[PDB]
Structure 1
Amino acid sequence: VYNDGYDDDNYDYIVKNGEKWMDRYEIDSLIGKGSFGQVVKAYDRVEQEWVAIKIIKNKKAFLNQAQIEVRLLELMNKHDTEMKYYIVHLKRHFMFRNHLCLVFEMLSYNLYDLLRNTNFRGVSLNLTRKFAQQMCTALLFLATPELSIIHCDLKPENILLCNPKRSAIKIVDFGSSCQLGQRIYQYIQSRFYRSPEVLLGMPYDLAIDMWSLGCILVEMHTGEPLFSGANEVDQMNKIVEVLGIPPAHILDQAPKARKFFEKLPDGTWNLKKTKDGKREYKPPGTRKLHNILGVETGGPGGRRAGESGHTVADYLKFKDLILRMLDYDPKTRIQPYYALQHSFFK
């Protein structure tokens, strides 16, 4: 009784291995499920190639959002820049049995899958560098004036390997993305990678992606997330643990500022008083990124100690660029063009 027997009770098209669609697509198997719906592996009998079909849920709310996602992907293809090689390519889309389907290029595993293969010990600084450089290029593509696309959900699971034996990557899942101004949501990023301006309920631009990328690169080398917030309040505190109290000029304009801080008569800002009055966090700015990365002590947990490619100078450059991506001020946060000119990329 769900789409004449084609959908389950959760608005998802029941994937039948071996089904042939529109005499063109030979569906192989289901790759995985997400909030939007499902992604399946399929062969295009026409192009004689493998593709990944993103099947949106048969529900108005999910359809209306995937329409924005399509227009954003089509607008990206209208700009034949080399930089969109770090964005996944949408080949075509169609409606099949009341489902909007997006035909993407076939890719490999996501960066979180990669971290799991290292037992979350992390990948090398050289690999992290290559991930960083491709990602800043992708962020610079979206920063193009005619585009001005905020991704809004950058996270390791949204960065895919083109091939499991190489370092090339592509950003996927633009389902939460918007163009500047046309921002429609206030609760947009994944907690672990949520920018302080979003946490504080302030206006946001394309810089929120840069913040997420900074959190991604640190996790890609250490293997564990930089800010493991169990909720919005725990998230904002774990950031303060590393970067200190947000500057007074940002907190003076944050609608949600009193969710995490209180203004002392001094004219200064400080964390709220936990009800229990107990210690759950380190004092602000006392959990140093210097020691998180193991700059002078052999890398994250001393794992890279005595190994090529992880010199003290290499970490000093890495820590500097990361601290520029983790700038509280979205207007001073390093932007993709100048991030690419950072000495960390030599």
Structure 2
Amino acid sequence: RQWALEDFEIGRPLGKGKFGNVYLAREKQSKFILALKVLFKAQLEKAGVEHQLRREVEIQSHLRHPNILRLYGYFHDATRVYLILEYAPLGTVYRELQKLSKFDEQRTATYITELANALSYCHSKRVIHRDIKPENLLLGSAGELKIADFGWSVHAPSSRRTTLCGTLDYLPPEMIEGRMHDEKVDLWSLGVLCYEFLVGKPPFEANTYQETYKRISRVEFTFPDFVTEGARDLISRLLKHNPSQRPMLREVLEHPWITANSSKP
């Protein structure tokens, strides 16, 4: 809506991404606190990711859900593109997990409910996120989960690939194999997260790319003894090689382990 860098006072860095250098900022006239995600045009051009940036802006700017981070607008200058985002004051789920090591069943079930609700809203518009990982799950002022980083988002179904040499840990077999995929991709990532929240590490983690790939394609994971029967049941339903066999989000939200442990309403 006609914004420029001179309209803001920039503050401390909130985080770093591959391309996204994110800062706290304040709009000079209103004093409103927000985050500016800064991207270097030369790096976007070298990598050939301009189409992903267009989808990030066009998809995220139209979503309105309390568990989805708002994108208010954007602007650019000679060397950088600036995305104007809602500021998430309590940081990332990634950092919460590094601090706590693992989450209890109540916190896990509450975060899974919030995801589920955000994804149910996305999927109602045929939007699939495809990059649900803890560094992209931000926390609002009341500690509520907010899905962010819509760079890999697309309208379903899709055959487009995600990263090339980056983390495979949250991706399903159909995406790592380059096959056509849909909304069921986010259901698989939900199962990976549920496991990582309870155990402290994702289920297919390995020292190499090929071994992680092998474990994902064969769905090779085991549970430590402390994981309860209800959590094992939900995780096992979500991590099914066949996407058509993965549950609907309403079945996740009504699962007896979720309703028994989540904080509501």
SS of the equivalent of 1:193 reads coil
Letter aligned with residue 135 of structure 1:
L
Letter aligned with residue 339 of structure 1:
V
Q: Say if 2:165 is the partner of 1:193.
A: no
Contact 1:127-1:167 at 8 Å conserved across structures: no
CA-CA distance at 1:98 after TM superposition: 4.0
Letter aligned with residue 116 of structure 1:
Q
Q: Say if 2:238 is the partner of 1:330.
A: no
Percent sequence identity is: 25
CA-CA distance at 1:187 after TM superposition: 4.7
Q: Which residue does the alignment assign to 2:108?
A: 128
Structure 1: which 4+ aligned runs deviate by more than 6 Å?
none
CA-CA distance at 1:22 after TM superposition: 4.5
Letter aligned with residue 57 of structure 1:
F
Paired with 2:247 and 2:74, the residues of 1 have a C-alpha distance of 35
TM normalised by structure 1 equals: 0.66
- Show structure 2 runs of 5+ residues with no match: 260-265
Q: 1:225 to 1:181 in 2, by over 3 A?
A: closer
CA-CA distance at 1:102 after TM superposition: 1.0
The RMSD of aligned alpha carbons is: 2.2
Paired with 1:337 and 1:214, the residues of 2 have a C-alpha distance of 15
More helix by share: 2
CA-CA distance at 1:207 after TM superposition: 1.2
Q: Which residue does the alignment assign to 2:121?
A: 141
The more displaced of 64-73 and 232-241 is 232-241
Letter aligned with residue 222 of structure 1:
V
Paired with 1:180 and 1:168, the residues of 2 have a C-alpha distance of 27
Q: Which residue does the alignment assign to 2:39?
A: 56
TM normalised by structure 2 equals: 0.85
Paired with 1:105 and 1:25, the residues of 2 have a C-alpha distance of 14
Q: Say if 2:132 is the partner of 1:154.
A: yes
Paired with 1:316 and 1:167, the residues of 2 have a C-alpha distance of 27
Q: 1:186 to 1:155 in 2, by over 3 A?
A: closer
Contact 1:25-1:45 at 8 Å conserved across structures: yes
Q: Say if 2:189 is the partner of 1:219.
A: no
SS of the equivalent of 1:191 reads coil
Paired with 2:243 and 2:55, the residues of 1 have a C-alpha distance of 25
Paired with 2:9 and 2:145, the residues of 1 have a C-alpha distance of 26
The more displaced of 134-143 and 28-37 is 28-37
Q: Which residue does the alignment assign to 1:102?
A: 83
CA-CA distance at 1:115 after TM superposition: 1.2
Q: Which residue does the alignment assign to 1:174?
A: 150
SS of the equivalent of 1:51 reads strand
Deviations 1:262-310 (A, max 9, x none): xxxxxxxxxxxxxxxxxxxxxxxxx643xx2x3xxxx25xxxxxxxxxx
Q: 1:223 to 1:26 in 2, by over 3 A?
A: same
Q: Say if 2:98 is the partner of 1:116.
A: yes
Paired with 2:41 and 2:163, the residues of 1 have a C-alpha distance of 23
Q: Which residue does the alignment assign to 1:25?
A: 8
Q: 1:63 to 1:29 in 2, by over 3 A?
A: farther
**Relative contact order, CA 8 A, sep 6+: which one is greater?**
2
CA-CA distance at 1:240 after TM superposition: 6.7
SS of the equivalent of 2:18 reads coil
* Residue correspondences, number: 250
SS of the equivalent of 1:75 reads coil
Letter aligned with residue 114 of structure 1:
E
Contact 1:199-1:232 at 8 Å conserved across structures: no
Q: Say if 2:20 is the partner of 1:40.
A: no
CA-CA distance at 1:74 after TM superposition: 2.4
